[PDB]
Design a binder for these strands. Structure first.
Length: 164
RNA sequence: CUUAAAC
């Protein structure tokens, strides 16, 4: 994490971080996608099924923070987009594709969608778990989430990796 | 206008 100085982001010095490099106001989770149908449907319908392992932390983060999902292909590490979580976990509105690994659904608001290869994105994702590959549904640091948002935005504005 | 958000 950032060792900039109390602890602050290395991208924006006004963002104060906890001792895990997380901002209490803006929080970021990686969704590793291995199912073309699921990601395709989520891009059309803006509903996502949340894995049981990550569901409680995501739900708790939603209480007091803006919460974002960053979608990455598990096998290729292509960035698929990012979205804000705009509903808490619920059992009322589930995607048809959810199964026993999922706790329930959330509504998302897509900010960007893409199918993007970026070697910096790949390197971030490869080292996201304290230097090892990202685990599905893990929270990342403020600066990782911000940098990924920036890279996706940059690619899109350069007309690279667009899906629309 | 596929303009990250927040600060």
């Amino acid at each position: 994490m950032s060792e900039h100085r109390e602890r602050i982001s290395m991208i924006n010095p006004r963002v104060v971080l906890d001792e895990n490099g997380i901002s209490h106001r803006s929080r970021y989770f990686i969704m590793l996608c291995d199912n073309e149908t699921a990601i395709a449907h989520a891009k059309k319908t803006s509903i996502w099924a949340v894995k049981k392992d990550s569901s409680k932390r995501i739900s708790d983060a939603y209480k007091k923070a803006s919460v974002y999902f960053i979608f990455v292909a598990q096998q290729t590490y292509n960035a698929l987009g990012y979205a804000q979580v705009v509903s808490d976990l619920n059992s009322t509105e589930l995607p048809f594709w959810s199964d026993s690994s999922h706790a329930g659904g959330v509504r998302i608001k897509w900010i960007k969608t893409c199918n993007l290869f970026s070697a910096e994105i790949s390197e971030i994702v490869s080292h996201m778990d304290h230097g090892s590959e990202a685990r599905d549904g893990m929270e990342m640091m403020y600066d990782e989430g911000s940098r990924l948002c920036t890279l996706i935005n940059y690619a899109i504005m350069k007309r690279i990796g667009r899906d629309r």
